[PDB]
């Protein structure tokens, strides 16, 4: 019964070890460090009536959407600090937000199993609230203007078209808490309450690979801009980078001083800097290749809860547990 599964897992571990010719840090020792980086607060967006949970940059670098526990999902203009829209969510709580690559529609999650879709483009009206799940929602994303990928409080992650769940992924021991998409729409990856982080194929609907190098709950998953890697943020202080081709943990980012959790993880336009928010009031910036911190961003008063980087890479926006959302350039 389980003996075959144990043997298969042992064989997979042996194969992964056999592919480890050299460590990533071994190659990176020749490269020069990025050096110390000083990050200023270009703007401090404010106005939220309560704590915020997640935010997503727009397809353009200007517009962004912020989601708060107060139910007020307000669209923001980063350049001129203007609240273009204020959409009061039907559900009292939201846990994630998403912005269409077309920019026409805006997605909001929620503690309620129902996922709502707002058609921003006079007055905002909900387009079609999704069917639901058995549990809450964790992260949402837009493959296109017609398909939204949702992560649930149960195992199942789903692709939604019509209020119909075209596919229903499964295989997670716990609850999926975050996901990210590749530059192409073919592949995407997701975390879980358990240490397992998996990669799914949207067309096939089967988890091609599974990475389980962590030891605590995974709270954030970012995707490499190249599309061949993805970074995980665990409940414990360690954040690590996985390579899809190598299918293991290439590098591990951690420090003795940091003991707090990690809430959001995002890369830069070039992928050199891994901007990771922490459960502490600060936000760290790590040199991805060299695994060395290159600055500390501690603007917020409360714990950070979201990060993001514009498609042009002009600036990185961090949203905290406090009402203040600060754009860092």
């Amino acid at each position: 019964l389980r003996q075959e599964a144990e043997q298969l897992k042992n064989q997979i571990r042996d194969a992964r070890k056999a592919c480890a010719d050299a460590t990533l840090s071994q190659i990176t020792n020749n490269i020069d460090p990025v050096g110390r980086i000083q990050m200023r607060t270009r703007r401090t967006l404010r106005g939220h009536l309560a704590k915020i949970y997640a935010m997503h940059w727009g397809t353009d670098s200007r517009l962004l959407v912020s989601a708060s526990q107060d139910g007020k999902l307000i669209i923001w203009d980063s350049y001129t600090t203007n609240k273009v829209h204020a959409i009061p969510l039907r559900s009292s709580w939201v846990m994630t937000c998403a912005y269409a690559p077309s920019g026409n529609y805006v997605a909001c999650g929620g503690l309620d199993n129902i996922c709502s879709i707002y058609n921003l483009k006079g007055n905002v009206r909900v387009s079609r609230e999704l069917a639901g799940h058995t549990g809450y929602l964790s992260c949402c994303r837009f493959l296109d203007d017609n398909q939204i990928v949702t992560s649930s409080g149960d195992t199942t992650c789903a692709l939604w078209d019509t209020g119909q769940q075209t596919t229903t992924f499964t295989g997670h021991t716990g609850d999926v808490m975050s996901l990210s998409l590749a530059p192409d729409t073919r592949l995407f990856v997701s975390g879980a309450c358990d240490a397992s982080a998996k990669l799914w194929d949207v067309r096939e609907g089967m988890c091609r690979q599974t990475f389980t190098g962590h030891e605590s709950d995974i709270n954030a998953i970012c995707f490499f801009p190249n599309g061949n890697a993805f970074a995980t943020g665990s409940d414990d202080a360690t954040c690590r980078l996985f390579d899809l081709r190598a299918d293991q943990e290439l590098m591990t980012y951690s420090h003795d001083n940091i003991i707090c959790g990690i809430t959001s993880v995002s890369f830069s336009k070039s992928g050199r800097l891994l901007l990771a928010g922490y459960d502490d009031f600060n936000c760290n910036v790590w040199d991805a290749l060299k695994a060395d911190r290159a600055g500390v961003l501690a603007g917020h008063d409360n714990r950070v809860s979201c990060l993001g980087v514009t498609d042009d890479g002009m600036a990185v926006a961090t949203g905290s547990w406090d009402s203040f959302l600060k754009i860092w350039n």
Binding site: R46, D301, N302, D322, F324
Partner: protein, 281 residues
């Protein structure tokens, strides 16, 4: 040599008051999270303390040490105006802080709705405006000028400038500045102490397994010991001119002045304020 040490002591007192008020104002203003509804009153108190410690305390030290006022009569009248305005503003801000605590404790549910940022701004503006009406107008205009034969020459003479008030203005100014706020805060803190004792008794009753005395005691005692003796001797000297000498008046006035620098030590002991002060330095 006695005057030389007194000058150093006065300079140290003025510097301490200025530094404390500046630190409190910077901590309140720089950090948005630290600023709140009730921190506007502390901001007003710190601003009043800073203005007093930069306007009257150094000028008062210059007057007492040299024993000759170099500035003109109008400038001395303006200086006394600023002094009295600052004192009333500080005491009324203490009273407003006390009544805010009373509203927050005795009526918890109605506290958040009744008081807002606009409400705090308007009440602080009203406090400053009533302080101005009590201080500036009766003293900028010559209502307060003494009708006594004494000090008529002193008011006429440019170099000499000592406070000789009418028998009527002194009592009214004291009542608006200290006595009424004293009664208000004493009653308010008695009510808050009763509520704290009730809560402690309830906690003891529910769970089988002097803190309120210390905080209330220090908060009320500092203010009372600093200001009450001065605001009683100023009335006594009006009632009985032979009872009070000038040196006693000056000493009590400056002991009351030191309360301006003492206030930040009693209204910034919260851990958030300490963290903000550590971060700022």
């Amino acid at each position: 040599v006695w005057v030389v040490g007194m000058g150093i002591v006065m300079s140290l007192i003025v510097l301490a008051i200025v530094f404390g008020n500046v630190l409190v104002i910077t901590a309140i203003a720089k950090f948005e999270r630290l600023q709140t509804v009730t921190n506007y009153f502390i901001t007003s108190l710190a601003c009043a303390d800073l203005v007093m410690g930069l306007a009257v305390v150094p000028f008062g030290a210059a007057h007492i040490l040299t024993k000759t006022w170099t500035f003109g009569n109008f400038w001395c009248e303006f200086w006394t105006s600023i002094d009295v305005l600052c004192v009333t503003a500080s005491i009324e801000t203490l009273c407003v802080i006390a009544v805010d605590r009373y509203f927050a404790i005795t009526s918890p549910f109605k506290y958040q709705s009744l008081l807002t940022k606009n409400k705090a701004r308007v009440i602080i503006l009203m406090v400053w405006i009533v302080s101005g009406l009590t201080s500036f107008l009766p003293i900028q205009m010559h209502w307060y000028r003494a009708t006594h034969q004494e000090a008529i020459n002193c008011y006429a003479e440019e170099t000499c400038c000592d406070f000789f008030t009418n028998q009527a203005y002194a009592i009214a100014s004291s009542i608006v500045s200290f006595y009424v706020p004293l009664v208000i805060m004493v009653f308010v803190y008695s009510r808050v102490f009763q509520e704290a004792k009730r809560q402690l008794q309830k906690i003891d009753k529910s769970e089988g397994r002097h803190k309120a005395l210390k905080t209330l005691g220090i908060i009320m005692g500092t203010f009372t010991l600093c200001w009450l003796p001065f605001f009683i001797v100023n009335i006594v000297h009006v009632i009985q001119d032979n009872l009070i000498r000038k040196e006693v008046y000056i000493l009590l006035n400056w002991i009351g002045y030191v309360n301006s620098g003492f206030n930040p030590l009693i209204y910034c002991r919260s851990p958030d304020f300490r963290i903000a002060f550590q971060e700022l330095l």
